């Protein structure tokens, strides 16, 4: 899903951020504002096979353009790079382990026992925000559908 990418950037060692900056600075050679338009992005696409339209190329940019410039800077470039690099059956069996009272939902307290049985020292903010991210209808519990979207991207 989304915030899993934003987490992957914060885990990049300075060995990769030097790799990516060097590649990004070759991207933006010839660009006047130092960012990636469709002109810079189309060059690299032809360089590795395909030739998308000037709107297929603008779709790739708008998927990661959070500042409304129509271009890609280095911070937005790192999000691009991590997107490019479990199943419902597995997640349903693990769902049953959370639901200890077996009522079909994961309420607050059942989350905390699982959290307190993880080895870490659990903060009340950790408890507070994991349920905010998981529970999207706001009814004090995580149901099956919400649990799937809550573990999307977790290995």
């Amino acid at each position: 899903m989304d915030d899993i990418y934003k987490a992957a950037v914060e885990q990049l060692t300075e060995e990769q951020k030097n790799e990516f900056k060097a590649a990004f600075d070759i991207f933006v050679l010839g660009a006047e504002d130092g960012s990636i338009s469709t002109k810079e992005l189309g060059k690299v696409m032809r360089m590795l096979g395909q030739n998308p339209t000037p709107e297929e190329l603008q779709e790739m940019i708008d998927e990661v353009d959070e500042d409304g410039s129509g271009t890609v800077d280095f911070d937005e470039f790192l999000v691009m790079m991590v997107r490019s690099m479990k199943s419902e059956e597995e997640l349903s069996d693990l769902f049953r382990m959370f639901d200890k009272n077996a009522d079909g939902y994961i309420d607050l307290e059942e989350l905390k026992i699982m959290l307190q049985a993880t080895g870490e020292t659990i903060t009340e903010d950790d408890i507070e925000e994991l349920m905010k991210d998981g529970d999207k209808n706001n009814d004090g519990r995580i149901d099956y559908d919400e649990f799937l979207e809550f573990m999307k991207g977790v290995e």
Binding site: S92, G104, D143
Partner: protein, 71 residues
């Protein structure tokens, strides 16, 4: 008992005299061992099915919740 009930009672006793009644003590010890291993194997498959049943009831209940809430 009537006659269909008499028939079923006799044909079941006949099933035992055919499989057992012509054996000696040694031949009949090996038969009981043989029959017990069938019971073990059948009770094991019954156990596996009893556990699957307890689990289906939970999956059914969760599906019952999801349909109940998504409308």
């Amino acid at each position: 008992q009537t006659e269909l009930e008499k028939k079923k009672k006799i044909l079941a006793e006949r099933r035992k005299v055919l499989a057992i009644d012509h054996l000696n003590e040694d031949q009949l010890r090996e038969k009981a061992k043989e029959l017990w291993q069938s019971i073990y194997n059948l009770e094991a498959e019954k156990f596996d099915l009893q556990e699957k049943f307890k689990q289906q009831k939970y999956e059914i209940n969760v599906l019952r919740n999801r349909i109940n809430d998504n409308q």
